[PDB]
Design a protein around this ligand. Structure first.
Ligand code: NAG
Ligand code: CL
Ligand code: CL
Ligand code: CL
Length: 499
């Protein structure tokens, strides 16, 4: 009875593990006449409609969303110790009630609810159910405020609809930020009015050659809107001064020798660099950041800064000293890869650490020192959360430069005591980046993203006290029938006792 269990799945069997789970009493059962009761507000109905849309296909129920009556499923905004993202979920014969202070909390409660329901809920045609929800109470709040997923749309371009699909994949696990890697050596993916060729030429191809693509400002705006409806704050990244061949190939004047390099379709890194000694370089950066900031309602702007191997150390420092202020000029908070820690991060900046266990102490120290100086840390170790890394030497896709990364390794660590010498309070959260040198279609993205994606979300959300591989793997194994029913391909790791 894998697809449609006789009894409801345990109230605690969800990912991320909730802060508090108190099972008790009989379950709730959604039936044909169930109404979704919400408060009389736009944001309330919004979450209500979102839930109805997720349930209507598999149940074949009407599931009206209204601001009156005593609906079997109620979403209510009220006071409580749930913060901006937490919620309380009560379940029993009397119905299911999700209470929170804000819409994001109700949304997160919905993500928990869809896991309490059976795998059949993922189907597109009416199913028999039963639509059971374990009885009891769940009180949930997040450990970290920065819980993100990155999608590389530069190595291989993914259109608006494919990005929306990935957004829905991550929304399942309460991620709250979407990092979009909009530019690299193989492509520039955002139209900039002041430099039209960046998109039309710089975005004309991708890894492996052939058609590439890019987002018009309208398309980017739609991605931001869709992400916002899924409570994901979009963090756009324009990598600099390295990983800039797409831009360099589009405008000869940006190159130190004044010659535009060919469009790049390979998979190597670290060979490109903006020309630090030219004034035009900074007019370019200002124009791009200014236009990107205007399209970004979010608080952050990622300027990258990693693998600028064609940029002398002194030049890199000088470059970052000059460009960081540009971000604040346009009202945003700068974010950069941890190499920025070696280039005097400005006040309020955050750095994304992608180091490994084997990274030298000197490099780790530089980042820990930045943390001591007030720089926020986003943890995404290359040998832990880089979703493009192979599970084993036999994985058909992905890379292996950071060694192999099985499911347990990706999950089995604690952000608070990860980087030696770094103050725990400097850790803002975690991120799971999905690079695309080897991935060209949505299904391939799924195979490399799952099953490690839920694990990184747990690290960002769950209390350290709930962290345990032996019990976590059981909750992860439980996702199998859901992904199968939803058509989500995933790596059936031998470390997980799949249900
Ligand atoms: C922070 C950063 O720039 N990461 C680079 C990225 O260009 C590449 O796609 C990925 C491969 O796993 O890891 C590094 O080589
Ligand atoms: Cl999905
Ligand atoms: Cl090459
Ligand atoms: Cl390389």
């Amino acid at each position: 009875d894998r697809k449609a269990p006789v009894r409801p799945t345990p109230l605690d069997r969800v990912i991320p593990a909730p802060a508090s789970v108190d099972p008790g009493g009989a379950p709730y059962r959604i039936t044909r006449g169930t109404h979704i009761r919400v408060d009389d507000s736009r944001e309330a109905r919004r979450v209500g409609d979102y839930l109805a849309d997720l349930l209507r296909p598999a149940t074949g129920y009407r599931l009206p969303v209204t601001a009156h009556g005593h609906g079997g499923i109620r979403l209510r905004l009220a006071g409580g110790p749930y913060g901006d993202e937490g919620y309380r979920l009560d379940s029993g014969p009397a119905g299911v009630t999700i209470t929170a202070r804000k819409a994001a909390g109700l949304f997160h409660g919905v993500q928990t609810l869809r896991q309490l329901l059976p795998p059949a809920v993922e189907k597109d045609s009416a199913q028999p159910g039963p639509w059971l929800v374990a009885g009891g109470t769940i009180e949930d709040t997040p450990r970290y405020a920065w819980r993100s997923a990155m999608l590389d749309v530069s190595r291989h371009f993914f259109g608006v609809d494919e990005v929306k699909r990935y957004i829905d994949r991550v929304a399942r696990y309460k991620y709250n930020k979407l990092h979009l890697h909009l530019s690299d050596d193989q492509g520039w993916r955002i139209a900039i009015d002041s430099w039209p060729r960046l998109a039309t030429y710089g975005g004309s191809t991708e890894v492996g050659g052939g058609p590439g693509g890019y987002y018009t400002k309208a398309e980017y705006k739609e991605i931001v809107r869709y992400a916002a409806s899924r409570h994901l704050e979009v963090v756009p990244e324009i990598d600099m001064p390295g990983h800039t061949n797409a831009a360099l190939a589009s405008y000869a004047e940006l190159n130190c020798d004044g010659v535009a390099p060919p469009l790049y379709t390979g998979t190597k890194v670290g060979f490109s660099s903006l020309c630090v000694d030219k004034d035009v370089t900074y007019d370019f950066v200002d124009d791009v950041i200014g236009e990107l900031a205007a399209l970004t309602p979010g608080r952050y702007l990622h300027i990258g800064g990693a693998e600028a191997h064609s940029t002398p150390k002194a030049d890199f420092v000088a470059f970052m000293k000059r460009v960081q202020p540009i971000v604040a000029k346009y009202g945003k908070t700068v974010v950069g890869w941890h190499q920025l820690a070696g280039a005097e991060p400005v006040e309020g900046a955050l750095v994304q650490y992608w180091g490994l266990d084997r990274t030298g102490d000197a490099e780790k120290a530089e980042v820990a020192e930045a943390a001591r100086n007030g720089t926020g840390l986003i943890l995404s170790p290359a040998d832990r959360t880089y979703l493009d890394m192979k599970y084993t030497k036999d994985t058909p896709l992905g890379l292996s430069w950071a060694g192999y990364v099985e499911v347990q390794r990706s999950y089995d660590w604690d952000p608070a005591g990860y980087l030696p010498g770094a103050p725990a309070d400097a850790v803002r959260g975690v991120e799971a980046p999905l690079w695309t040198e080897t991935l060209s279609d949505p299904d391939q993205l799924d195979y490399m993203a799952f099953p490690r994606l839920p694990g990184v979300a747990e690290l960002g959300w769950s209390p350290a006290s709930t962290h345990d591989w032996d019990t976590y793997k059981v909750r992860l194994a439980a996702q199998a029938p859901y992904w199968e029913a939803a058509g989500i391909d995933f790596y059936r790791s031998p470390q997980v006792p799949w249900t």
